[PDB]
Amino acid sequence: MKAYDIIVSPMLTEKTNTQRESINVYVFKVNKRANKKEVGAAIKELFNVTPVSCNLLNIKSKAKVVVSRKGYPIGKGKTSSWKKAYVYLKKEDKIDIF
Amino acid sequence: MGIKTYKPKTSSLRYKTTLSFDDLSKGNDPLKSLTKGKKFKSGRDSSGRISIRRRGGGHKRKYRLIDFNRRDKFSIPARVASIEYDPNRSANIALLVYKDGEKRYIISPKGIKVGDVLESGPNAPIKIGNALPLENIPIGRTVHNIELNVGKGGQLIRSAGGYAMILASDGNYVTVKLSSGEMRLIFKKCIATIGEIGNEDYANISIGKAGKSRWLGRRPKVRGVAMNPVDHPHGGGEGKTSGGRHPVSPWGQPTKGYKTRKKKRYSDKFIIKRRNK
Amino acid sequence: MKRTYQPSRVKRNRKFGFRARMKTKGGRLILSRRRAKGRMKLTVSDEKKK
RNA sequence: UAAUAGAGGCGAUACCAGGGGAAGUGAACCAUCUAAGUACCCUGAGGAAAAGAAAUCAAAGAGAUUCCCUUAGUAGUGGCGA
RNA sequence: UUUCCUGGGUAAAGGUCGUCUUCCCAGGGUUAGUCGGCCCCUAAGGCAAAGCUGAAAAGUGUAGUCGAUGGGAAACGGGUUAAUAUUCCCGUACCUCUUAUAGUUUCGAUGGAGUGACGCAUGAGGUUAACUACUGCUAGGCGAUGGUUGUCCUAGUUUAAGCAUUAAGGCGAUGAUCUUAAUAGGAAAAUCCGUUAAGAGAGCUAAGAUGUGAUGAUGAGUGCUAUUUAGGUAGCAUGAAAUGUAGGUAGUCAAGGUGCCAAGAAAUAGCUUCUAAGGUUAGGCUAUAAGGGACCGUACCGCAAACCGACACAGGUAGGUGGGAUGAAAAUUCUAAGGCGCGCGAGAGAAUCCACGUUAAGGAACUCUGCAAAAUACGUACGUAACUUCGGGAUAAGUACGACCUAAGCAAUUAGGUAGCAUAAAAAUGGUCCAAACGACUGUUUACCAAAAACACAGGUCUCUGCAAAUCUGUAAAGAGAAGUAUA
């Protein structure tokens, strides 16, 4: 898996924004098959900077209840689960694309 | 040996007696290299059914590797190191330390003491504790731990306080009176240990209460007349019957006098005169 | 009152899981029958509980 | 061990061959008998399977096996009861 | 399994209402080398090549492999968000390895050995968070009503892992580590053989205490700003006020010490150690700086409207914390922190239903039956029978004292004085005696009308069983009996 199938997209959220502003942390949606090592390698190849460390989470799928055309519960649908990455850079390092 | 009695400070202690362990090198833990932890049995078999009833959860105990087959150590003297309590059998166990450094357990005879030297083989002296083939033991001695097939080990008498009486020798066979009282022929090449087995007060004990019987791993016994006829041939006790039937086991086999030994067994040749009632 | 369904998880998966079904003849018949009927859930292992 | 070749499992709550094989019932009880070699289980295959080129039928002179029509509810069989 | 947080909504669901909700809609939220797993180990147990037995399916079963509720490298304190933290940040540590350097010197198994490694009861003692008793130090108050700038009132006075120092106690001088000489195990060994000759050898374990960690953090408070229900609450700044004495619990020392019989896991892991096939920078070891932490779980409820009971159900649900006063106590009552006021109410009080309080005179006259209630109840003293297996019966029965102040006294109690109808003043806290039947007794039993005289029981007798034992489960093999042996 090339370093392009690893990193999916960043996250722009209030929590991630404050974290990035304060302690220089970047949060990404990554592929579920990645791990710490190739996430770090992918960050290096993509943005030409080596991260101090990486943390990964598995976000479970959010369940929804599906109702008929009239509308009344007939089953349980679900969103897609995904993997979230916190990436820690050195205090001088930055990522510009954001 | 001896019996220690109790003052009746509770209604259960009135008839509790236990052994006194004075003839035992006390304060003892078993040799770590000869004992392994084990389950408690409770009488269930590989299929998981109960094959023997009324056996349950007693005190947890380790297993001590005994040696009833001293044959591969002929001519090598050994030292008695200690006399120890064994929870897996009535008799006590002696720890022999051999001259080559190997240590082993044996059934402790009656009257041996720490520091004694024990020897096994045809050349051994006739002394309590020595193991010799029946050839060499003179008529008129008392032996124990008799081997039944060469190389098998001691499969005959082994329990506390027992001994067997050598009566006669002839051809390939020696006549031996066993503790049940029958006279049986033994092949002359099997080994035996000289002298009685110590700890002869083991069965003079009065257990005292149902709890100790539970400690010994013995679940309660339910009579047959307390049953229903579906449960036991004797059931039907609408006001204390006596079975209404000749006594039988729970499976219909007669029990007052019925002889259950096979009528054409292979060993019938070697039994001179059976035991007495 | 303690009652009929004390819900363990190791017991659930060990006793009624897919591998326990495949492990013997009757379990494989169970699986074939449920496949034929077209059940949406074949075993208790479709409830992801370890 | 090596070398290849072929098998493993599923489908078809159908069909086929082989092995094991009931009982509710009927006989106005019931045990022989019936239901029935049915239900079910197990092992094997196939596009069909099985069977098949007479050490056969049977009193006619026919000429392998298999499937329909008739013989015929006849010949027999059955606590000669069902 | 999103029920968690924020914003929005009231078809329905909420036993009423609803702007509200655990309900609905959208978005956000779970960050680990140290936590729990994964992993290396085994117990109960499952599976199982071979072997054996069976019409078939399969059944037994050894070598092997899985299987925690157990054994195994490593972290604590504080802060921060609307929600996550032993995970992030701050401060300070620890454990494993990969490479490289420098001093090196014997490394290397799926094999051997040691350790791992354990019971119950029971004191007494060493230390100690929490907790109150006092002194002081700090912050606030000096009080709508008599007295209160004092011996006043209220509150705080906090702070870990790790590291260094030493060491209460215990085990130890009958030997714990070691040094040779011999060697009948199973790979063969410089280890274990701990077996045996000497003879040199006393150290090991260990809570805790001090310092550092820590001029840090925390911090009752105080100060600006807005806001206000005129009470505090939102942020921002700032703030050693004892690391004081004495008492002292539950932990811990302690897998301790001392007794007892019912004689008290396993490991191939971890730790240490020995070598074969082999290796002699091929490594292993001691450091030292450089960097590598796998994969999964992490939100929220978790004595409950989020689990189990069809329910927003008077039920059930393991373990650790368990403040203060009273007291022997985790009893009883009250109360701090904290959390709640049971998800229909408001009027009226008729009969009656259920649950309670009190009562003239009599005290079981009620009734199948003293059923139910009432009564007895604590502590310290006095005094206790028939009968008995000599232990008991026995808390037998019966009775006295108990408050407050002062004095004596170590305390328990003693004396005097004072007050009340009542002084174990509340609550909690045995009714007793006589005789008979049955069962000896402690226990067990009809989950959901029978708890008993039934079952069990220690004890007794008869009888079977010589070990490829009797017995039991199966067509068998096979397993239990039993790794037992007629004192079974």
Author numbering:
A (entry chain AV): 1 to 98
B (entry chain AD): 1 to 277
C (entry chain Af): 1 to 50
What is written in the article reporting this PDB entry?
The ribosome is an RNA-protein molecular machine that coordinates the vital process of protein synthesis in all living organisms. In this work, we report single particle cryogenic electron microscopy (cryo-EM) structures for a hibernating Bbu 70S ribosome at 2.9 Å resolution and a 70S dissociation product form or assembly intermediate form of a Bbu 50S subunit at 3.4 Å resolution. A Bbu hibernation promoting factor protein (bbHPF) and two ribosomal proteins that are not annotated in the Bbu genome, bS22 and bL38, are found in the Bbu ribosome. A unique N-terminal α-helical extension in the Bbu ribosomal protein uL30 partially resembles the bL37 protein in mycobacterial ribosomes.
In this study, we report a cryo-EM structure for the 70S Bbu ribosome in its hibernating state solved at a resolution of 2.9 Å. The structure contains 58 resolved components: 3 ribosomal RNAs (23S, 5S, 16S), 1 tRNA in the E-site, 21 proteins in the small subunit - uS3 through bS22 and the bbHPF protein, and 33 proteins in the large subunit - uL1 through bL38. Of these, the existence of two previously unknown Bbu ribosomal proteins is revealed directly through their cryo-EM density: bS22 in the small subunit and bL38 in the large subunit. In our structure, we find bbHPF bound to the decoding center in the small subunit of the Bbu 70S monosome, thereby confirming the sequence-based expectation that it does play a role in 70S ribosome hibernation. Its binding site overlaps with the expected binding site for doxycycline suggesting that simultaneous binding of the two may not occur. An E-site tRNA was found interacting with the C-terminal end of bbHPF with no mRNA density near it. Maintenance of the bbHPF and E-site tRNA densities in all sub-classes of the 70S ribosome obtained through multiple 3D classifications suggest that bbHPF and E-site tRNA colocalize on the hibernating Bbu 70S ribosome and are not a combined density due to two separate bbHPF bound or E-site tRNA-bound Bbu 70S ribosome populations. In Bbu, there is no separate bL37 protein, but a N-terminal helical extension of uL30 occupies the same pocket by adopting a bent helical structure.
